[PDB]
Write a structure and sequence with these properties.
The complex is a heterotrimer.
Chain A lengths: L7
Chain B lengths: L7
Chain C lengths: L7
Classes of the chains: A little secondary structure, B little secondary structure, C little secondary structure.
């Protein structure tokens, strides 16, 4: 999986 | 796959 | 994978 999105 | 929704 | 969506 990719990284989380930003806030 | 895409990363998760951000904070 | 790509970054997730913005939170």
């Amino acid at each position: 999986p990719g990284p989380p999105g930003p806030p």
